[PDB]
Amino acid sequence: MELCHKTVKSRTAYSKHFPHKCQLPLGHSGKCLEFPFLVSLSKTHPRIAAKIVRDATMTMPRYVAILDDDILLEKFNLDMQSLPEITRLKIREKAADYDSCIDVARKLTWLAYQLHGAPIPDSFTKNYLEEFFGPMVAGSTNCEICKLPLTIDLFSEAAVETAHKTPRLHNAENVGFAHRFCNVAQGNKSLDEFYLWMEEVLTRVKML
Amino acid sequence: MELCHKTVKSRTAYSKHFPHKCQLPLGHSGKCLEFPFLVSLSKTHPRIAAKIVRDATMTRMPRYVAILDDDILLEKFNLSLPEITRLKIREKAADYDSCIDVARKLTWLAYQLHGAPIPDSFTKNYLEEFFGPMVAGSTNCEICKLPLTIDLFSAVETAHKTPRLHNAENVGFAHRFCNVAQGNKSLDEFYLWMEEVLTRVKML
């Protein structure tokens, strides 16, 4: 589909200098929204919707953490040169453009409706997300590391976190959900490196 | 062997109520010392020596202090706080003797690291008495099972094979990655977890 992309009215700091964008279809029979695919979820599970937005959008916003020092200082009043080297480094480590952050939000909502125990999504949400990522398959959502089926009750606050299959890549394809344990075990390795690692370790331990 | 164990002079908070003990062999000449097996290392690798002492004795508060109850903590040590700091301090509590044991084991491991300096005869003979012959480059990640190098100590962490067990048999070194990965699982549970993970991914 083609998206609205019209500027969404906001009282956000970012909104004073940059636009939040309409994510409704270009056609669009109402008021223009940033997170339409989350409306039902916000109605049924407020903290899950909010956690999806936060993990998709925040570190300050990831699409602010990508802006250069001059723009931070002048338009947001952030003197990066004041902060110690390490916090500048970590801030940059979390950077992602605006569209990517929204993409991630969409992916995570799509995964969430396929959790065991998930609410049933309305037809708009279902069709909109399915258009992006394919048919929803009930109960298919697993830990990206564990490969264990996740239940929505886990998201209750955590025990579940947002995962990046390959380190430092913030887009729809690369994200999912993971047990806290599995997510911290993976650390700075990609999935394939992590599995390869486990394989070598076990080989070694089975020797002697 | 038989150990000195006479009180060692300290300006420490613990020492006003409990002793620091000589760990030289009983009837030693010279002054009595708590960490004799570490003086040589402290000369060339003070950071490593310091890490060994911290990991063996500390939790902020010593492990052998944290094995004492709140009443003695307010009375003897004059210490009332959040719960996830309190029981978290309780978690890693161990007897003073076990702590020193851990320090011995860690030093014995350190002298067997690739690139390790060579121990002096006192240190070598003393530690080998407790743990057996040092063999060069034998020190491996407790988890990875790969050989460790001394330059990793600029990372490496002290590992516990079984959680909640601070003794010589149970401790070793581990790459930072391997050690955080293990989290709160024993070694066997961690390997078993890996096997389940690989089994599931090979099916997909």
Residue numbers in the entry:
A (entry chain A): 1 to 59, 74 to 171, 177 to 227
B (entry chain C): 1 to 59, 73 to 92, 96 to 170, 178 to 227
From the paper:
It indicated, as supported by mutagenesis, that DraIII possesses a ββα-metal HNH active site.
The structure of DraIII was determined in the presence of an 11-bp canonical DNA duplex containing a phosphorothioate at both of the scissile phosphodiester bonds. The DraIII monomer contains a ββα-metal fold (β1-β2-α12) in the C-terminal domain where the HNH active site is located. The DraIII structure is composed of two domains: the N-terminal domain (α1–9) and the C-terminal domain (α10–13, β1–2). More importantly, the domain interface opens up to the active site tunnel the substrate DNA would bind to (surface mode). Six potential hydrogen bonds are found between the two domains along the domain interface, which can be divided into three regions: the mouth, middle and hinge region. Among the known HNH REases, the structure presented here is the first for one that recognizes a gapped sequence.
